């Protein structure tokens, strides 16, 4: 069934999915520094408390880059869900920058570094709560882009 | 056999997808290398200069290098094995160099931080191995892209 036109659909849905999964991986990098590198460079181990002011700045850079790549996402079909992650990335980046009072210093404590970018422990006052539904908003976007690719492939085998 | 071409397409789809995960992880290390080395959050612009304190930014980048080595280990493809094992070794060598130079890498000097995890620097003694697995993934990323294209190429043939 219209094999030459389907290949364009499959390729188009591929590019959209790839661009979302790239934003996905940037989020997973923000997660890895949160649960593996917060307050911890050594011969063994690959403990040092209360000094993460740099690690916070690097993760702020990733969050900006996440917004830039989201602005480059243009697909008239996924427009509903793209703008959701669009403004979700905005409230996140703004939140860390909104209060530099505990994030724009060299010695940010563990309970504050775990607070802004670690979505695991209990306290999520200023920070990781906004990281929370930014991840979830990309989950929605990633699933939709996956299903659009599957539906394009599904068009091949139709009777 | 349109069903068999379907599996060839979606299979090389997943490999390219998993390879681009390693690719995007590297762009994060690249982004924290060119936009957050020696830095902290500001109000108006978002980031302002903060010299000589990057002992956690390097610790952050180390976990991604560990995460990169993890994803490269999970890659299983008999057609891409050559380029897969080339990136695994370059991933092992990189994380090994960061742990080998722990004397000068709290608060690593921006001269050392730019030297250790930044591609665009002259010296690159503590970075040189960040280019040889970036380009190794580049070669890996191009091969997976062409494998997907070749699968779609089979769809339209006489």
């Amino acid at each position, epitope marked *: 069934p219209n094999l*030459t036109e389907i*290949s364009k659909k499959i*390729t188009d849905s591929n590019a959209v999915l790839l661009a979302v999964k790239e934003v996905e991986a940037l989020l997973s990098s923000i997660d890895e520094i949160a649960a593996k590198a917060i307050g911890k460079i050594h011969q063994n181990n690959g403990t040092e408390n209360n000094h993460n002011g740099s690690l916070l700045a690097g993760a702020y850079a990733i969050s900006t880059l996440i917004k830039q790549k989201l602005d480059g996402l243009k697909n008239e079909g996924l427009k509903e869900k793209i703008d959701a992650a669009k403004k979700c990335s905005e409230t996140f980046t703004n939140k860390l920058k909104e209060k530099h009072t505990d994030l724009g210093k060299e010695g940010v404590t563990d309970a504050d570094a775990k607070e802004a970018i670690l979505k695991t422990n209990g306290t999520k006052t200023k920070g990781a709560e906004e990281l929370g539904k930014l991840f979830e908003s990309v989950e929605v976007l990633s699933k939709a882009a996956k299903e659009m690719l599957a539906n394009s492939v599904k068009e091949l085998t139709s009777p | 056999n349109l069903t068999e071409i379907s599996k060839k397409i979606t299979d090389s789809n997943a490999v390219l997808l998993a390879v681009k995960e390693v690719e995007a992880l590297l762009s994060s290390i690249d982004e924290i290398a060119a936009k957050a080395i020696g830095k902290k959050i500001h109000q108006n612009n978002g980031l302002d200069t903060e010299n000589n304190h990057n002992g956690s930014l390097l610790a952050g980048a180390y976990a991604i290098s560990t995460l990169i080595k993890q994803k490269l280990d999970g890659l299983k493809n008999e057609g891409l094995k050559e380029k897969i094992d080339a990136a695994k070794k370059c991933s092992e060598t990189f994380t090994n160099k960061l742990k080998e130079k722990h004397t000068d890498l709290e608060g690593v000097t921006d001269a050392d931080a730019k030297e250790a995890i930044l591609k665009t620097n002259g010296t690159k003694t503590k970075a040189e191995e960040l280019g040889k697995l970036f380009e190794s993934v580049e070669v890996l990323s*191009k*091969a997976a*892209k062409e494998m997907l*294209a*070749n699968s779609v190429k089979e769809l339209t*043939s*006489p």
Partner: antibody
Amino acid sequence: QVQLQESGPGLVKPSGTLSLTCTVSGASISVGNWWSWVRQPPGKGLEWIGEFYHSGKTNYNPSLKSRVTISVDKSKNQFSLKLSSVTAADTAVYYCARSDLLTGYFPYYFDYWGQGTLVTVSS
Amino acid sequence: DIQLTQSPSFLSASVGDRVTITCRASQGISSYLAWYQQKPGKAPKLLIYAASTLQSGVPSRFSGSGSGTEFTLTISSLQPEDFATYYCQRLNSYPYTFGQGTKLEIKR
């Protein structure tokens, strides 16, 4: 820079076999990309001849399939072309070209060419 | 299988003029089309791929459009260096048949 260069005799007697070799530098045919032979008679348009990928897959122009053969020497980073039972209709400038995905994911576009060599079919 | 018809065969316009070249396919080829610029004695130079995308290095005054069977190459602000023969090419399947070509002369 990526550079392609054809070589071989420019005069072939009729009913003979055309043979050309493409030397590639700045790139590796074993690593990736499709590599092709393209044909242009004096004054006329262009005709694609054949292509190959390092995986082994090789496609030929159906109008030439019976008399065309492409060989690859990965150790020398060269590939060749063989046209048999040649006539005056085979006199042309012959190009070896590379195909690439560019910024897309399908299909491959001819983005690098050799300088081209002219072969004349005459007694 | 699929033939490409290029129009016109010959074109002559002045510097600064706008010119249009049409490529018609016998059946749909989606956006898998390319435009080439061949200067005398030289190999073809890719200008546009996937039928609207500008190849890097090519000036913006070259633009392509179309999908399916209708295809159009437009050169704005015509320049003396633009004298060449222009070819369209389909790339959905082998042989990737080229158009017959359009000869462009720069008026003076």
